[PDB]
Amino acid sequence: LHIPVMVDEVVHCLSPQKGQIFLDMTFGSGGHTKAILQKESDIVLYALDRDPTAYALAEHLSELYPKQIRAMLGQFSQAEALLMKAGVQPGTFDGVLMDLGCSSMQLDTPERGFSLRKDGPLDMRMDGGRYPDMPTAADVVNALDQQALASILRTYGEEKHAKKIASAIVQARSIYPITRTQQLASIVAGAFPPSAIYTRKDLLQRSTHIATKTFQALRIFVNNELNELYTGLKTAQKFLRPGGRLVALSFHSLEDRIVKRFLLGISMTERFNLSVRQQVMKTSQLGSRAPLMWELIHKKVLSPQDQDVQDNPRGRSAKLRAAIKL
Amino acid sequence: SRYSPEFKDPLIDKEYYRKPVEELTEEEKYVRELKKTQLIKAAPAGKTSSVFEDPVISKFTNMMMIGGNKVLARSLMIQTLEAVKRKQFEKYHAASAEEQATIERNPYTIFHQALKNCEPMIGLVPILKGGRFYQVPVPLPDRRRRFLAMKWMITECRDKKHQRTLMPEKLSHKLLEAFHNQGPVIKRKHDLHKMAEANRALAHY
Numbered sequence A: 001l002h003i004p005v006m007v008d009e010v011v012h013c014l015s016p017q018k019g020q021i022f023l024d025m026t027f028g029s030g031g032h033t034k035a036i037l038q039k040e041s042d043i044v045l046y047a048l049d050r051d052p053t054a055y056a057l058a059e060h061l062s063e064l065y066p067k068q069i070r071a072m073l074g075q076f077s078q079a080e081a082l083l084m085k086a087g088v089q090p091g092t093f094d095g096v097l098m099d100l101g102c103s104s105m106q107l108d109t110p111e112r113g114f115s116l117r118k119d120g121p122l123d124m125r126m127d128g129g130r131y132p133d134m135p136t137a138a139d140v141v142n143a144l145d146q147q148a149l150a151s152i153l154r155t156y157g158e159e160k161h162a163k164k165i166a167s168a169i170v171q172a173r174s175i176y177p178i179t180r181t182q183q184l185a186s187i188v189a190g191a192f193p194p195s196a197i198y199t200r201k202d203l204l205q206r207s208t209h210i211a212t213k214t215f216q217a218l219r220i221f222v223n224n225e226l227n228e229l230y231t232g233l234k235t236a237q238k239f240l241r242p243g244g245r246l247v248a249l250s251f252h253s254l255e256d257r258i259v260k261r262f263l264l265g266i267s268m269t270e271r272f273n274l275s276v277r278q279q280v281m282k283t284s285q286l287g288s289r290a291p292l293m294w295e296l297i298h299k300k301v302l303s304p305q306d307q308d309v310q311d312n313p314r315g316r317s318a319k320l321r322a323a324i325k326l
Numbered sequence B: 001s002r003y004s005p006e007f008k009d010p011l012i013d014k015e016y017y018r019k020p021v022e023e024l025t026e027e028e029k030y031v032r033e034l035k036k037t038q039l040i041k042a043a044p045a046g047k048t049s050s051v052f053e054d055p056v057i058s059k060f061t062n063m064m065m066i067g068g069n070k071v072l073a074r075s076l077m078i079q080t081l082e083a084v085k086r087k088q089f090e091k092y093h094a095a096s097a098e099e100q101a102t103i104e105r106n107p108y109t110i111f112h113q114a115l116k117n118c119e120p121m122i123g124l125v126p127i128l129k130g131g132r133f134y135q136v137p138v139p140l141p142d143r144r145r146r147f148l149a150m151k152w153m154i155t156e157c158r159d160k161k162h163q164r165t166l167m168p169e170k171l172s173h174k175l176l177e178a179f180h181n182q183g184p185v186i187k188r189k190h191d192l193h194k195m196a197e198a199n200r201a202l203a204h205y
């Protein structure tokens, strides 16, 4: 079982109260959505997900609360149109809970293809066939050139060995099609000496497969999570009430940066991890930020309790960024 | 060029040659004795000594010329000058004796003043800074201001907004608008100036 990550913080943060309408742009399993419909019995809630399996769960769970929860299906970009059909263009949503990442059910079910450990079709697509033409991870690896595929790994996977892990994929695909998760994992391992398979470690300091950065990289290029995250936040702002509390959850750095640089106005094209020294050097050259539209409830990113991390290691990297619209 | 660097451009000016010798300075006397030893390029077909020669209108005609069709370009020019003159003779006969004094009927005076009202004093340059583009204001040389006035006027008349209107009617209408400090081309001048004022703090780049 997967407990909703930081459910206690997200509930306190949004303080759901009677007379307030809320949105959920990532229903998924619905653990967070259900934790929010428990504290306040008079709450109004809206749900959304990219997975039709997740949208069916919400529809089945809608029986528990007939109108307090309203289920919707679609991507972040398509969310505004879907909600615009309802007619809530101003929205006046008190809070938008934009949980991020892959659902526990999505990656616990081997058929969905998200787990390298198990053997499933190399789908790695949050979409559940709602768009049967949407390329899957298998398609991405078999088509793109080394330079193109290396960029996917480098930019989205934070993978130093992008050229080494991409060349192995290019050679492997020629010999046979890459259609299964384990088939890819073995190819990526084959780019390195056999001992490399578990040399790398996580921040938890527990050995991880040497292809855990290629499964994350493709997952984010197949589902365009990063570009869809920028529109998703923007749409929330337009549909978010003034004085309404937004709450995001970033499990990896790339998504965390966008949430940080969006709630603070920082340009998305600035250099990453800028030090104070570099900031001085940057502006010294020019010598020769706009008003913020948010009020961060908690100034610094929250993180899961160390005890809770061991119980749910999947959510160890959950960085909660809360803000109030201005 | 088929002219060697030794070839000098011809000076087509009747007055310059009839000027008496006594009025000449010792510097101007040297220039005249020097040119007698220099090679001179053949006069181009464009410019002559005619009293009706106008270098500004000849330049505007070339900026309107498409594919070397000078006959058509010049036809449009003279049709515009005739259309401007007829519009002013119509405004003149319909006016009172007092207003008639303020009505200009010379199309060359209107053409020149119409362009001078469109010349932008200051312009902007698209500059790159830190992977980001920001425009920078800069003074404009005299050549550039005159060229931009003629390019904005010709561009406006070629705009697709005008539906089935012939060029001599479009250009004549725009020239008379600019002659009165009104029109789209005058707005383009004002917008460029107003933008060059909002980027004054970027003048140090």
Ligand SMILES: Nc1ncnc2c1ncn2[C@@H]1O[C@H](CSCC[C@H](N)C(=O)O)[C@@H](O)[C@H]1O
Binding pocket: A025, A026, A027, A028, A029, A030, A031, A032, A033, A048, A049, A050, A051, A054, A074, A075, A076, A077, A099, A100, A101, A102, A103, A104, A106, A126, A223, A225, A228, A229
């Ligand atoms: N661009 C996008 N638009 C909509 N839903 C998206 C999305 N990217 C990811 N999702 C979905 O959002 C969820 C995030 S992970 C699951 C979190 C959820 N609160 C839970 O009950 O556990 C997944 O269901 C995922 O498929």
